[PDB]
């Protein structure tokens, strides 16, 4: 289990946190649990909507969710009909006043998580994994990624002996802390088993 | 009656006020006419013709 998590190593420097609140040792665990719940719910709901990052932020006994999604239109539905609906359920989950914001993700080919999800979907609907991977890589490159890597693993083409294959393009420096490396993962629950998809997308280096 | 109504308001009787220029800050000679005309916007808009 060689490698360090690329997001996790960079949280202090170039990457920010998702859950962004303060709490004392008393209420912290509970808060975490709540976050887990709400996030889980959101994932369940907005599966068909291309959702990248849920950012929870709770000040003053009131939860502020921020959903980063590629297509707001399907998450919002009719203007303030679906969002509103989501909100009350979120509140219920939390046990506090809820507030949902929806950030529009520019360039969903450069968002790593989204790409991973897409790949997983493709796998599920029985495409050639390799061709999917290629598409993922190519598209990102076209869009202006300084580099991208993707990796898929296990029961590829329903083969008895599992293996991993991966496509890199451009440069993807992981040891370099100041590199904006959007990393994320997904899992294709195929007929032969799970197929795990990792993808690293290098936006560029930050100078500060 | 236009002149008499312009005398009820504190405006000059001729209908004409001396106007300065916003560019140069100096007076236009020979005082000009200022008033309120009811101007309409017709539906021949330029970004339907370009």
């Amino acid at each position: 289990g060689q490698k360090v998590h690329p997001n996790g190593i960079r949280l202090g420097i170039v990457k920010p946190w998702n859950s962004t609140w303060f709490a004392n040792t008393k209420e912290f665990a509970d808060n975490l649990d709540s976050d887990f719940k709400v996030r889980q719910y959101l994932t369940k709901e907005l599966a068909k909507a291309s959702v990248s990052r849920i950012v929870i932020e709770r000040p003053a006994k009131s939860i502020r969710v921020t959903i980063h999604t590629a297509r707001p239109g399907i998450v919002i539905g009719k203007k303030g009909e679906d969002v509103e609906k989501l909100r009350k359920v979120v509140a219920d989950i939390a046990g506090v006043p809820a507030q949902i914001n929806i950030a529009e993700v520019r360039k969903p080919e450069l968002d790593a998580k989204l790409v991973a999800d897409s790949i997983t979907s493709q796998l599920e609907r029985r495409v050639m994994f390799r061709r999917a991977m290629k598409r993922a890589v190519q598209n990102a490159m076209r869009l202006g990624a300084k580099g991208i890597k993707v990796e898929v693993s296990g029961r590829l083409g329903g083969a008895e002996i599992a293996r991993t294959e991966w496509y890199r393009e451009g440069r993807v420096p992981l040891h370099t802390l100041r590199a904006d490396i959007d990393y994320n993962t997904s899992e294709a629950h195929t007929t032969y088993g799970v197929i795990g998809v990792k993808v690293w997308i290098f936006k560029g280096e930050i100078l500060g | 009656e236009i002149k008499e109504l312009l005398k009820l308001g504190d405006l000059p009787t001729s209908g004409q006020i001396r106007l300065y220029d916003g560019r140069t800050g100096e007076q236009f000679e020979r005082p000009v006419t200022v008033g309120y005309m009811y101007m309409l916007k017709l539906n021949h808009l330029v970004d339907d013709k370009m």
Partner: protein, 100 residues
């Protein structure tokens, strides 16, 4: 509201049916978000059919020349109106006058 008009603005803005001229006079209830609700004075009010007049405001919609025909209420809540008086200003109208 044309400062220099001819006084024929009133007749054109009423007689062309773009404003919501009151059918029966009286006061007002003014729910109005959806409709003007006018309580009718008793002299103009029928014995049966107790009756209060509910005017439908046509909000933002397409005209024949792609302009916007829109009606806005020009009376407040709890305010007397008479028969033939205007209640909602149409497109290009200002308090029952004619503002092109």
């Amino acid at each position: 509201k044309p400062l220099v008009g001819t006084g024929m603005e009133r007749a054109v803005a009423v007689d062309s049916g773009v404003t919501a001229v009151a059918k029966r006079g009286g006061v007002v209830q003014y729910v109005d978000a959806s409709r003007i609700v006018i309580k009718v004075n008793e002299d103009e009010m029928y014995p049966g059919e107790a009756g209060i007049d509910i005017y439908n405001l046509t909000k933002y919609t397409r005209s024949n020349q792609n302009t916007c025909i829109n009606q806005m209420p020009c009376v407040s809540l709890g305010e007397p109106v008479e028969r033939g008086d205007v209640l909602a200003d149409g497109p290009s109208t200002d308090l029952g006058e004619l503002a092109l």
